[model samples]
Target: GSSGSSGPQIIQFPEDQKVRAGESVELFGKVTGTQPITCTWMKFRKQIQESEHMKVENSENGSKLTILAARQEHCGCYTLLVENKLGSRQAQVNLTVVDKPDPPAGTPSGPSSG
Candidate 1:
């Protein structure tokens, strides 16, 4: 609309992240050029609502997605959408959750096989 401002597109997007289980990961970006721009996240085509293990923060600059105790189940492509009364825009973020490796052969630190 004529009353609304232009663009609130992403200015800076975080690179793809590789995090192992129990590790923490953050995906963030800056969306500028307009006021009242709202930011939200989605993964695998599903909206990612903020919770204890996940956080979504947005401001005049942009938004951030933080994952606590990142795990294999978290690996996927995420998209951040920023919009306002004018229109909307989005950016993609790829994240890979790696699992911890097992110990070498004959290592007693690993699972019991005796």
Candidate 2:
């Protein structure tokens, strides 16, 4: 075998996370291999962009996807794309966001009273 550089190797992949509304969520991914590894994030198989409620950060080792405030629409599969000169890798994590349960209205407020 020839001694050559290696592509991005994922050491740690994001795990499935479930949270309620108005909560924050963070997903981290760690990789090992050559330099200049690129990290791309996507939701529901579509690329995602950083916004006030969402942010994406990429470092030399890995990347991070964060949601400031979780909402019902945030529930979906999030994927991370890692690539370099040698090769590329990808993975995904499921996110489930649930809304808070509503309180009870009241007791017997009907007309009949026994």
Candidate 3:
């Protein structure tokens, strides 16, 4: 018994992403290829690690990254690598996180003088 085999192919991946502080954002990648494919996430040349505020999920044909309560430091490049028996593929995304504005100071009222 034999079947067709292929390398991992990335179909969809976001190029740019934006989010505000204290908010959450999710990044997704859609891939297609042979079975036993492996998925990995990296940032700044380092493999990404899950945390209380960050979640990583990998599936048969796709992967997702969720950042909860995103902060300014989280604004950076993200990479996703999909590998299989035939070959491997990778993609990157730049995520931008904006900081909330500070509270405005009150102004003094002008009197009808002079």
Candidate 4:
């Protein structure tokens, strides 16, 4: 009983470990030994300011944060804070926004190779 039922447990996201810019990134996680984990998504360790581009969705039991059309500014450290009667725990991920490769140089058609 003591071994089975013990300390608090927290969840994390990106579970993937890598993400790309201009792409939709989803964050999902849960908490153990607690109810209703206080989940908040942050950018650069600062509280997320309300904006049209930013969206937060909380499920019946967990939380989900989505950043539509992610940009370079969106790339940063993100933390998921979970607090309850037991204790508090956090999970973080360093988001990296990879720039898309440049297009190849092209010449106008109609010119013949010489």
Candidate 5:
């Protein structure tokens, strides 16, 4: 007699998501029934190349993945790989970067209204 489960579950982002180009965004995910999960943040199918633009900060308990100063290049699919003695589970998220809206049309005036 034996009982076991396998296969990684894919995760999706929220709908109507919006983020500025130069702004920062945080991506999160959780894995159950597994310990010492390995998390990897990627951009455009490639690992985050820049050190400053992206970072992998593990919590004291080592579960959550925090991405600081997320930029345009950070827009892509973020994959997390979790492995253990029983089996392995994985999850992914699609990130999108949008440019900040431009300033409203206006002109400075010294003395217009009298």
Candidate 6:
């Protein structure tokens, strides 16, 4: 029972998330179409991969990206691309890694030439 359909439509898109540095997070995005579509995850427009610090799980409906240990450099814009013969669709989110500032050195000055 197929109707003259169009591109992939996102049903449940992932939301932006914030995490502290060294913490872990999981992200997922789901989409629907006439048939199975390919989903690719990216960061800052660059394709991402599974590493010691990250893992990628995908299926016909959606994808899951998990960070084992998020680092300050890992924080950035993320995107999920879903496409098929009918057409294509995309979703994006920002993953922020909050970290504490470096401790001040230099004797922690607080004097006025006393």
Reference-based lDDT, each prediction: 0.82, 0.84, 0.85, 0.63, 0.52, 0.82
Best by lDDT: 3
Off by over 4 Å in 5: 1-16, 43-45, 59-69, 102-114
Q: How does model 2 fare in lDDT?
A: 0.84
Q: Which stretches of candidate 4 lie over 4 Å from their true place?
A: 1-8, 101-114
Query: Order the candidates by lDDT, highest first — what do you get?
Result: 3, 2, 1, 6, 4, 5
lDDT of 1 at 86: 65
Candidate 6's displacement at residue 104, Å, is 20
RMSD (CA, Å), candidate 3 to true, equals: 7.8
Q: Order of candidates by TM-score, top first?
A: 3, 2, 1, 6, 4, 5
Instruction: Write out the backbone clash pairs for model 1.
Output: none
TM-score of 5: 0.57
lDDT of 3 by residue, 10-111 (tens): 889988868888788888899888878899989888888899678999998688888998988898998999998889999999998888665455556644
Question: Tens digit of lDDT per residue, candidate 2, span 1-114?
Answer: 756467887779867878888788878889777788888988888998899788988998799888988878889998888999889889888988878765445558654544
Worst 10 residues of 6 by lDDT: 105-114
Cα deviation in Å at residue 43, candidate 1?
A: 0.9
Q: Candidate 4, residue 13: CA error in Å?
A: 2.6
Q: Which ten residues in a row have the lowest lDDT in candidate 2?
A: 103-112
Tens digits of lDDT, candidate 4, 1-114: 344323345544564354566777777665565454456656566877546656777553566677777788777777776665557667777776666764465566734444
Off by over 4 Å in 1: 1-5, 101-114
TM-score (C-alpha) between model 3 and the true structure:
0.81
For model 5, the run of ten residues with the poorest summed lDDT: 7-16
Evaluate model 1: give its lDDT: 0.82
